[PDB]
């Protein structure tokens, strides 16, 4: 379940197991230096059989490593208070007003803010300027009838901005 | 005593003015936290007296 | 014509009006009746509100 491929790989699965074991062992072990010792022990236990040519042995010991880690997890891991699930989960979402608003103001308030709204007018002209032709040409140009991926190529041809840019450029500052 | 009931009811009614005040405000008075703080402090310093009469 | 002449005028209209369900009339009537029956020695609220002499019971 990823935008680039269909599956990750075996190596990514061992890799994420390393990262999650390291994080849950942070949450398990206080004082940070006995933690550093045990993290080096975990690095050595992964250095036991890095040199396997077999594949069914690799995925079998990976499955057993998943079993051992699920036996040795922690109920409240130290999820960071920026990530969803933690203490943020968009903590300051009160002021994440998107920019399709702020144009529905009375022209008295628009007279209070002349320069910012004139620059917003030139940004809106930049959106409208080469919206239709170049973006429809690049999006009808490059793929086969099966899209088969969720990325998009940049505007490498001649000129203007890479396509489908507006709602990724225009976004809240994540600390409003 | 008239003082006892009078001061208890004004401790109740000091907790009435800021709500109606910024219901009828229409001008964004930026010292409204200071306003709420000083009226709660005044409500406490009026509330200590009838308790003192009560224990007296 | 929907708030400034309706709402506050209706508030002053329903705030006071005659004694609805004869309420304070019943208050002052009960005060005079309790003082009356305390003065005349009989207990207040004589039970059997209808006259027990004014009955014609079906005999058996």
């Amino acid at each position: 379940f990823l935008p680039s491929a269909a599956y990750l790989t075996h190596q990514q699965k061992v890799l994420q197991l390393y990262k999650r074991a390291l994080r849950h062992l942070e949450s398990r072990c206080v004082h940070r230096d006995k933690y550093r010792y045990f993290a080096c022990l975990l690095r050595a236990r992964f250095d036991e059989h890095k040199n396997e040519k077999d594949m069914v042995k690799a995925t079998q010991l990976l499955r057993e490593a998943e079993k051992e880690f699920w036996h040795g997890q922690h109920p409240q891991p130290y999820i960071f208070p920026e990530s969803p699930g933690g203490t943020s989960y968009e903590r300051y979402e009160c002021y994440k007003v998107p920019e399709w608003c702020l144009d529905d103001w009375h022209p008295s308030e628009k007279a209070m803010y002349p320069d910012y709204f004139a620059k917003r007018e030139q940004w809106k002209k930049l959106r409208r300027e080469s919206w239709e032709r170049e973006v429809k040409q690049l999006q009808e140009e490059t793929p086969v009838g099966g899209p088969r991926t969720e990325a998009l190529p940049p505007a490498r041809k001649q000129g203007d901005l890479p396509p489908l840019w507006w709602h990724i450029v225009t976004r809240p500052r994540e600390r409003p | 005593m008239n003082l006892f009931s009078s001061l208890t009811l004004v401790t109740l009614i000091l907790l009435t003015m800021p709500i109606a005040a910024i219901n009828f405000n229409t001008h964004k008075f930026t010292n409204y936290p200071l306003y709420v703080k000083t009226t709660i402090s005044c409500a406490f310093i009026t509330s200590m007296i009838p308790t003192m009469m009560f224990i007296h | 014509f929907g708030f400034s002449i309706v709402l506050v005028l209706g508030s002053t209209f329903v705030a006071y009006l005659p004694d609805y369900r004869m309420q304070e009339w019943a208050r002052r009537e009960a005060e005079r009746l309790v003082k009356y029956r305390e003065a005349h020695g009989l207990p207040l609220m004589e039970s059997n509100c209808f006259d027990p002499s004014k009955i014609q019971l079906p005999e058996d």
Partner: protein
């Protein structure tokens, strides 16, 4: 009363010979003048009812419902544009005149001396709302909605006619005093049980009870705002007032024969509070909310305590106000986005910054916030039913818990948490919708200040 009737007749050609861009102001202005005129009604006192000569009278039960109706009319008459403000001049005048004629039969129905006059004006109240919701229902099943509507209400309301002609031709005329002052207790035959079943079942159809409750929700979600608010508020509380009239007769048999209707009402109150916890189609949740509160009303009517009647009329008027408001809010949200569903258009705390206060105040008067009239009604109904039986209070509080649950779920579902940022069309709030909000919630809180008015004849 005829001085409170004939300016509604004279209000009908106002709309016709008012020219273009002029009908709106004249209709709203003069219906508010009628609201003052009906606010001048309240004179009733002490011993008797107030007679408005021979054709008419008013108990102190019909009076608050009548003043509620004529106050609710200008609210609706301003509510009912922006989906027909671009239609034709003649059809617009026809719509507004049909609303006025509908109000006229509402006042005719509330002010009745004879139950035959009451029944004629009852189905006269029925007939225009049919046309209004069928013509402007704005969804593909409004045909089925109006069809189920008229067929359920006539097919239930029909043996009431035979029973009332029977009471006419066996016990004199049908003044409410002369239906009173003369009624002998009719004992437990089976014919008495059938006649009681006819009258009470006709009004059971009109409430609705639980066995006949699918009458309602199509006729709300596939109906415009005017017919919806008239339907819910005035028609359901009109059926309630009709049973409050006719229940004076047949007292020694309703004890033995009124157990199963209490039962179906209680279990349907529970299951209806459960059914409107999970649904989409936001408009329908208020409809099943109304079904739950009217099942509570029916429990309150069929037990026969003065406490129960006071709680009954308080719950009637307060729920009429609350449901009419919350329908107007759902109309505002549908005029913002043309979806009618629930999970789609979330957010709306950032945008529409004071509309959230009205959603909050409507959901808390639906929550029975305790100084409001709604908790007064629900509370005295709970008191009277615990006097009726010692074990029914679990069902009442279970209704209370689940009612709070679905009302506050409605509050924190559609208007809490995240704009979906593909909506990008809604404009901030008009002064008209906020004006309708201030038309809603000022009379409710003013009645919460002075509630000695709306309590019933057994005050």
């Amino acid at each position: 009363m005829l001085k409170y009737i004939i300016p509604t007749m004279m209000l009908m050609p106002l709309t016709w010979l008012s020219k273009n861009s002029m009908i709106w102001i004249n209709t709203t202005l003069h219906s508010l003048l009628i609201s003052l005129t009906s606010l001048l009604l309240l004179n009733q006192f002490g011993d008797n009812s107030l007679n408005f000569s021979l054709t008419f009278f008013s108990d102190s039960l019909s009076t608050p419902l009548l003043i509620l109706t004529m106050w609710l009319l200008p609210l609706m008459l301003m509510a009912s544009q922006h989906h027909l403000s671009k239609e034709n001049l003649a059809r617009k005048k026809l719509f507004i005149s049909m609303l006025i004629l509908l109000q006229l039969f509402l006042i005719m129905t509330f002010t009745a001396t004879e139950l035959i006059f009451f029944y004629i004006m009852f189905e006269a109240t029925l007939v225009p709302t049919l046309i209004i919701i069928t013509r402007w229902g704005n969804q593909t099943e409004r045909l089925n909605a109006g069809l189920y509507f008229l067929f359920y209400t006539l097919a239930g309301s029909l043996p009431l006619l035979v029973a009332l002609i029977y009471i006419q031709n066996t016990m004199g005329s049908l003044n409410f005093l002369i239906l009173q002052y003369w009624v002998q207790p009719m004992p437990n035959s089976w014919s008495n049980t059938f006649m009681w079943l006819a009258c009470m079942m006709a009004f059971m159809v009109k409430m609705p009870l639980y066995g006949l409750h699918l009458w309602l929700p199509k006729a709300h979600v596939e109906a415009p705002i005017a017919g919806s608010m008239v339907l819910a508020a005035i028609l359901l509380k009109l059926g309630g007032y009709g049973m409050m009239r006719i229940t004076l007769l047949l007292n020694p048999i309703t004890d033995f024969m009124a157990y199963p209707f209490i039962m179906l009402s209680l279990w349907g109150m529970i299951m209806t509070s459960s059914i409107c916890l999970r649904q989409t189609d936001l408009k329908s949740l208020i409809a099943y909310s109304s079904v739950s509160h009217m099942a509570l009303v029916i429990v309150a009517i069929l037990i026969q305590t003065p406490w129960s009647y006071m709680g009954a009329t308080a719950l009637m008027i307060a729920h009429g106000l609350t449901s009419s408001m919350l329908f107007c809010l759902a109309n505002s949200n549908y005029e913002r986005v043309h979806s009618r569903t629930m999970i789609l258009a979330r957010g709306l705390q950032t945008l529409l910054p004071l509309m959230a206060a009205w959603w909050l105040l409507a959901s808390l008067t639906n929550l029975a916030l305790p100084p409001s009239i709604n908790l007064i009604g629900e509370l005295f109904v709970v008191m009277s039913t615990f006097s009726w039986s010692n074990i029914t209070i679990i069902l009442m509080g279970l209704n209370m818990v689940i009612t709070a649950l679905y009302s506050l779920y409605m509050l924190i579902t559609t208007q809490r948490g995240k704009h979906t940022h593909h909506i990008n069309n809604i404009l901030p709030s008009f002064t008209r919708e906020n004006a309708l909000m201030s038309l809603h919630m000022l009379p409710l809180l003013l009645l919460s200040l002075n509630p000695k008015i709306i309590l019933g004849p057994l005050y």
